[PDB]
Amino acid sequence: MAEVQLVESGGGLVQAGGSLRLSCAASASIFRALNVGYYRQTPGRQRELIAGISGGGSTHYADPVKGRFTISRDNAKNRVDLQMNNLKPEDTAVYYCNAGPTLTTGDAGPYWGQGTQVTVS
């Protein structure tokens, strides 16, 4: 089994309407071929896949974030980015990078990141 070690970055705090960009990277080459998604968790709620990208760049988003979030990848840099625009207070959550999910069903793959805090005033 491939050792994919996910490294997350890009958290912060903004006002309603502001923007953040989360980034997820792994040194394993196979990261480029894997589906990658961002899950978000409210303190006492289940994780939900809100944005996912295929190996080739095909994207799918949860309905609450469509038209505001854009997931993209730079395979040359072994990195996946989630640009979050027009952030709203309900977007406040812990965001988790996940490699290998099934994008239609949202079933998470075996590789998880450490989690990134996002706060919107």
Side-chain angles (χ1 to χ4, degrees), residues 3-4 6-45 47-65 67-76 78-109:
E3 54 258 3
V4 180
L6 303 176
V7 178
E8 304 190 14
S9 51
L13 161 69
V14 307
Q15 282 178 271
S19 302
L20 293 170
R21 189 192 69 162
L22 312 181
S23 284
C24 180
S27 54
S29 48
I30 201 143
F31 173 80
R32 306 203 281 276
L34 289 186
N35 291 335
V36 175
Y38 265 106
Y39 293 69
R40 79 180 167 194
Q41 151 250 295
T42 279
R45 287 188 182 176
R47 300 193 193 178
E48 161 180 7
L49 176 68
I50 52 104
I53 191 155
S54 72
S58 297
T59 63
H60 299 289
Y61 304 93
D63 317 280
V65 307
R68 298 188 300 126
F69 289 28
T70 303
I71 188 174
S72 72
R73 57 194 315 155
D74 180 15
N75 285 359
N78 268 40
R79 209 184 69 239
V80 174
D81 297 307
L82 176 63
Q83 175 78 17
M84 308 184 288
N85 295 321
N86 185 26
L87 278 161
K88 305 173 182 188
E90 62 266 41
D91 287 325
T92 302
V94 181
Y95 288 71
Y96 296 92
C97 181
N98 185 255
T102 297
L103 300 196
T104 37
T105 68
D107 282 11

